């Protein structure tokens, strides 16, 4: 067949874009890694919160968090760090990220680009 | 009218 382990790394993508792809999935706690735009060694962790914009039918909200980088490592407005998006996300997939506002983002399953059915 | 960008939900650790 074909050897290749695809994770949750998309790459080229724009903010307004991710929102669409995510909201389209219609799946709560749907995280996805993507490479910022012409950003200097930076990343972004998008997640589709289970909280709807209005009610039962609106496109789930999208939490955009900039993932800084410290000499290879990564951090989120915190003093802590992580080997890479893997160690970071993973550690967050069990705990979760807290938003100054007062919300806790959850990452149960990533976001893959490539359906099976038509 | 163009999507200038998207807001980023602040965090706790950070001020």
From Swiss-Prot, chain A:
It is found in: Cytoplasm; Nucleus. Isoform 1 is expressed in hematopoietic cells. Isoform 2 is expressed in non-hematopoietic cells. Phosphorylated on tyrosine residues. Binding of KITLG/SCF to KIT increases tyrosine phosphorylation. Residues 8-111 form the SH2 domain. Transmembrane segments: none annotated. The N-terminal SH2 domain functions as an auto-inhibitory domain, blocking the catalytic domain in the ligand-free close conformation. Tyrosine phosphatase enzyme that plays important roles in controlling immune signaling pathways and fundamental physiological processes such as hematopoiesis. Dephosphorylates and negatively regulate several receptor tyrosine kinases (RTKs) such as EGFR, PDGFR and FGFR, thereby modulating their signaling activities. Monomer. Interacts with MTUS1. Interacts with MILR1 (tyrosine-phosphorylated). Interacts with KIT. Interacts with SIRPA/PTPNS1. Interacts with LILRB1 and LILRB2. Interacts with LILRB4. Interacts with FCRL2 and FCRL4. Interacts with FCRL3 and FCRL6 (tyrosine phosphorylated form). Interacts with CD84. Interacts with CD300LF. Interacts with CDK2. Interacts with KIR2DL1; the interaction is enhanced by ARRB2. Interacts (via SH2 1 domain) with ROS1; the interaction is direct and promotes ROS1 dephosphorylation. Interacts with EGFR; inhibits EGFR-dependent activation of MAPK/ERK. (Microbial infection) Interacts with HIV-1 Vif; this interaction promotes the suppression of cytokine production. Belongs to the protein-tyrosine phosphatase family. Non-receptor class 2 subfamily. This is Tyrosine-protein phosphatase non-receptor type 6. It comes from Homo sapiens (Human). The lineage of its organism: Eukaryota, Metazoa, Chordata, Craniata, Vertebrata.
Curated annotation (Swiss-Prot), chain B:
The cytosolic N-terminus contains two immunoreceptor tyrosine-based inhibitory motifs (ITIMs), which are essential for the association with INPP5D/SHIP-1 and INPPL1/SHIP-2 phosphatases and functional inhibition. It comes from the Eukaryota. It is found in: Cell membrane. Coiled coil: none annotated. The gene is KLRC1. This is NKG2-A/NKG2-B type II integral membrane protein. A motif (Immunoreceptor tyrosine-based inhibition motif (ITIM)) lies at residues 6-11. Immune inhibitory receptor involved in self-nonself discrimination. In complex with KLRD1 on cytotoxic and regulatory lymphocyte subsets, recognizes non-classical major histocompatibility (MHC) class Ib molecule HLA-E loaded with self-peptides derived from the signal sequence of classical MHC class Ia molecules. Enables cytotoxic cells to monitor the expression of MHC class I molecules in healthy cells and to tolerate self. Induction: Up-regulated in memory CD8-positive alpha-beta T cell clones upon antigen-specific stimulation. Phosphorylated. Predominantly expressed in NK cells (at protein level). Expressed in intraepithelial CD8-positive T cell subsets with higher frequency in gamma-delta T cells than alpha-beta T cells (at protein level). Expressed in memory gamma-delta T cells (at protein level). Restricted to a subset of memory/effector CD8-positive alpha-beta T cells (at protein level). Expressed in intratumoral NK and CD8-positive T cells. Expressed in melanoma-specific cytotoxic T cell clones (at protein level). Heterodimer with KLRD1; disulfide-linked. KLRD1-KLRC1 heterodimer interacts with peptide-bound HLA-E-B2M heterotrimeric complex. Competes with KLRC2 for its interaction with HLA-E. Interacts (via ITIM) with INPP5D/SHIP-1 and INPPL1/SHIP-2 (via SH2 domain). The modification Phosphotyrosine is found at residue 8.
């Amino acid at each position: 067949g074909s050897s290749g382990s695809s994770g949750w790394y998309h790459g080229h993508m724009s903010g307004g874009q991710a929102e669409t792809l995510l909201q389209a999935k219609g799946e709560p706690w749907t995280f996805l890694v993507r490479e910022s735009l012409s950003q200097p060694g930076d990343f972004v962790l998008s997640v589709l919160s289970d909280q709807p914009k209005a009610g039962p039918g609106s496109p789930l909200r999208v939490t955009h968090i900039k993932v800084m980088c410290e000499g290879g490592r990564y951090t989120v407005g915190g003093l802590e760090t992580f080997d890479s998006l893997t160690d970071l996300v993973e550690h967050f997939k069990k705990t979760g990220i807290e938003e100054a506002s007062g919300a806790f983002v959850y990452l149960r399953q990533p976001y893959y680009s490539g359906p099976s059915s038509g | 009218m163009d999507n200038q960008g998207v807001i980023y939900s602040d965090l706790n650790l950070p001020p």
